[PDB]
Amino acid sequence: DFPQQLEACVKQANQALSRFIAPLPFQNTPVVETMQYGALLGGKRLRPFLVYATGHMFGVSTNTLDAPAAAVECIHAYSLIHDDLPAMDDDDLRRGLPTCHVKFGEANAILAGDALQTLAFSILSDADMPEVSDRDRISMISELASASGIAGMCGGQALDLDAEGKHVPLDALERIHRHKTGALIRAAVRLGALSAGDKGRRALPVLDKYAESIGLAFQVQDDILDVVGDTATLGKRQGADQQLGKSTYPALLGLEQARKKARDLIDDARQSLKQLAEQSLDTSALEALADYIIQRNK
Amino acid sequence: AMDFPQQLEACVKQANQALSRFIAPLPFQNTPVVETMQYGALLGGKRLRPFLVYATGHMFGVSTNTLDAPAAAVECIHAYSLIHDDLPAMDDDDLRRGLPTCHVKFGEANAILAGDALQTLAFSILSDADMPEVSDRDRISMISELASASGIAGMCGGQALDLDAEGKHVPLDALERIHRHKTGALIRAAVRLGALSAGDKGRRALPVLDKYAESIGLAFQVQDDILDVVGDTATLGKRQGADQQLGKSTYPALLGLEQARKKARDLIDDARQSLKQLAEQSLDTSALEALADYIIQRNK
Ligand SMILES: CC(C)=CCSP(=O)(O)OP(=O)(O)O
Ligand SMILES: CC(C)=CCSP(=O)(O)OP(=O)(O)O
Ligand SMILES: CC(C)CCOP(=O)(O)OP(=O)(O)O
Ligand SMILES: CC(C)CCOP(=O)(O)OP(=O)(O)O
Ligand SMILES: [Mg+2]
Ligand SMILES: [Mg+2]
Ligand SMILES: [Mg+2]
Ligand SMILES: [Mg+2]
Ligand SMILES: [Mg+2]
Ligand SMILES: [Mg+2]
Numbered sequence: 001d002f003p004q005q006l007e008a009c010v011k012q013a014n015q016a017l018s019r020f021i022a023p024l025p026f027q028n029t030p031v032v033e034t035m036q037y038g039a040l041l042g043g044k045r046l047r048p049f050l051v052y053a054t055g056h057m058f059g060v061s062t063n064t065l066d067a068p069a070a071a072v073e074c075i076h077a078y079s080l081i082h083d084d085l086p087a088m089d090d091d092d093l094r095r096g097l098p099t100c101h102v103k104f105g106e107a108n109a110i111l112a113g114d115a116l117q118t119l120a121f122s123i124l125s126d127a128d129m130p131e132v133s134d135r136d137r138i139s140m141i142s143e144l145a146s147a148s149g150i151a152g153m154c155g156g157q158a159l160d161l162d163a164e165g166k167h168v169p170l171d172a173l174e175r176i177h178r179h180k181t182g183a184l185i186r187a188a189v190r191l192g193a194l195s196a197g198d199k200g201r202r203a204l205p206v207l208d209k210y211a212e213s214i215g216l217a218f219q220v221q222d223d224i225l226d227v228v229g230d231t232a233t234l235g236k237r238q239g240a241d242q243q244l245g246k247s248t249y250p251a252l253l254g255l256e257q258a259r260k261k262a263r264d265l266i267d268d269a270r271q272s273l274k275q276l277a278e279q280s281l282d283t284s285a286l287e288a289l290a291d292y293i294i295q296r297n298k
Numbered sequence: 299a300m301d302f303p304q305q306l307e308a309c310v311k312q313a314n315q316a317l318s319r320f321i322a323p324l325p326f327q328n329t330p331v332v333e334t335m336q337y338g339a340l341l342g343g344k345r346l347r348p349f350l351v352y353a354t355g356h357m358f359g360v361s362t363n364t365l366d367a368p369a370a371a372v373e374c375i376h377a378y379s380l381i382h383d384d385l386p387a388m389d390d391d392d393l394r395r396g397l398p399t400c401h402v403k404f405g406e407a408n409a410i411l412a413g414d415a416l417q418t419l420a421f422s423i424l425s426d427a428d429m430p431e432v433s434d435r436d437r438i439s440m441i442s443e444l445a446s447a448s449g450i451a452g453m454c455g456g457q458a459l460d461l462d463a464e465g466k467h468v469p470l471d472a473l474e475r476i477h478r479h480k481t482g483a484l485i486r487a488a489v490r491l492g493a494l495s496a497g498d499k500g501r502r503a504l505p506v507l508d509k510y511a512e513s514i515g516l517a518f519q520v521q522d523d524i525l526d527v528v529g530d531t532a533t534l535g536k537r538q539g540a541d542q543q544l545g546k547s548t549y550p551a552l553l554g555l556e557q558a559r560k561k562a563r564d565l566i567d568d569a570r571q572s573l574k575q576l577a578e579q580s581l582d583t584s585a586l587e588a589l590a591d592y593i594i595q596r597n598k
Contacts, residue, residue: 025455030462111454124441134435150418154411157414
């Protein structure tokens with residue numbers, strides 16, 4: 001039952017984040033309230049899911065995986081807070097609630113996003129991960145940083161800002177999505193595998209292919225749902241991309257062709273999972289998620 | 299012997315070289331966002347935090363080349379913090395380091411992402427850069443420290459209290475709290491990163507180096523408050539009376555100029571008292587003595 005595994009992942013990840021947010025100073029001040037709101041209230045937690053599902057393949061303990069799970073979700077949550085700001089996408093709705101900058105003001109959203117970024121790295125450097133070597137811990141931190149910064153998520157966000165109003169062609173659009181979305185999703189998978197020493201790293205070339213495909217599919221589905229989704233189901237505004245002239249898969253290719261591309265990427269993702277079930281790994285959660293990425297309505 | 303003004307410039311040249319070396323391999327060169335990081339990180343600034351890193355590591359025989367990593371890292375964090383600080387939602391400044399601020403020059407969006415990227419870059423340097431005499435444990439401790447000094451327990455927490463204190467004329471203890479977090483934490487991290495580069499010898503010095511750093515840390519910000527009142531815009535690189543314009547809670551606003559000055563003097567008195575304990579173990583404290591003094595003698 002995949003919806004129960006989602007649900008359980010959400011609960012598990014939220015307690016992980018709360019564990020790491022609890023010892024922080026300034027509890028019940030605006031800025032920290034904004035971090036909790038942005039990190040913990042709503043969300044599918046698909047990236048934590050990727051961390052846990054990857055790590056679980058190699059038999060690493062869930063409790064260990066809480067660290068990298070919470071960390072990728074901190075980067076993710078920070079990314080949404082900034083992405084909603086007036087200078088960026090100017091959204092007032094996210095996860096069925098007023099966005100961070102709307103409820104707490106711009107200054108607090110900005111700072112809460114900054115602080116969440118930093119918390120991702122406190123967690124990866126300070127958290128208990130019993131069976132993870134120092135060298136491996138450094139590799140997780142290195143990967144998360146590269147995936148989140150100008151070579152990954154921030155760099156894609158900048159390609160996205162520059163492509164507003166230009167209706168860039170397919171190759172450039174692929175480049176935007178792979179960076180702004182794909183990179184962090186590949187970091188999730190990679191953090192899961194990096195928790196698992198030699199066997200985890202032996203799976204990386206293939207898990208990489210898997211991650212690059214679901215990562216891109218995830219963003220084209222995000223683009224598709226922006227066009228055809230209900231504001232009430234999505235938790236954020238239908239038509240937000242059209243309204244700003246964002247370059248997207250549906251705007252360029254139309255809906256049918258964009259759905260077709262997302263399906264091609266999941267077919268390919270499934271091929272890469274087929275190679276892992278040959279290294280004796282149980283890919284069942286990673287397959288269910290890959291389907292879910294393009295079948296979901298939120 | 300020792301000629302502070304040329305050490306300061308050599309440190310700027312060395313830190314800029316280090317920053318540059320870590321930015322060059324990055325993708326999207328000559329695009330608005332990397333232009334914004336380069337502008338905000340490299341064009342001007344005193345590089346006092348890198349000075350702290352270098353000077354501290356040098357006391358323990360640590361190689362300058364190794365120290366380029368933590369030093370560029372603390373300066374990456376510092377630079378990001380300024381870009382976000384000047385934003386219209388924050389301090390709404392149009393002028394820094396003699397030039398238009400990143401948001402005026404590049405747009406708000408580009409300034410937010412440049413800042414975001416510079417923070418991340420800080421952690422990519424500490425995780426990736428070569429640091430041959432530094433152990434894994436010490437590199438993790440460098441990351442953990444920069445992290446807790448940069449976020450809500452340090453610089454960001456400090457910026458949020460600063461923002462909350464606008465128009466609220468907070469008393470001395472709450473003002474000290476603001477300054478120790480928003481400014482102190484990162485200067486202390488520069489010192490800690492220098493010491494952690496030296497492994498065990500550096501760790502044994504931390505209790506004391508912390509006392510030093512805690513005092514120059516606070517001093518830094520009270521002198522920054524004083525300079526906001528009495529400084530020439532053209533010398534500061536930033537607008538005189540910006541604090542007074544936003545109702546910021548500052549040392550001079552609360553205590554007046556004489557008393558803020560005296561508090562800065564007293565904190566450097568204390569900072570140099572701590573450094574005497576380190577010179578007693580035959581560590582050369584002269585560069586940190588000199589910097590402590592420059593922190594309240596400076597006019598920018
Ligand atoms: C926020 C980041 C880095 C990426 C996602 S793209 P987006 O602006 O389309 O995201 P939403 O549709 O706003 O959820
Ligand atoms: C920029 C950070 C984190 C702290 C310093 S306080 P400030 O806003 O007074 O600094 P400036 O005077 O704007 O340089
Ligand atoms: C497309 C994207 C990177 C922005 C939102 O991603 P998401 O649909 O996983 O958002 P949630 O965390 O709210 O589920
Ligand atoms: C007061 C403060 C922490 C912000 C500016 O610090 P600073 O005077 O070192 O600024 P520079 O990097 O421009 O020298
Ligand atoms: Mg958005
Ligand atoms: Mg966006
Ligand atoms: Mg979208
Ligand atoms: Mg300020
Ligand atoms: Mg300011
Ligand atoms: Mg100031």
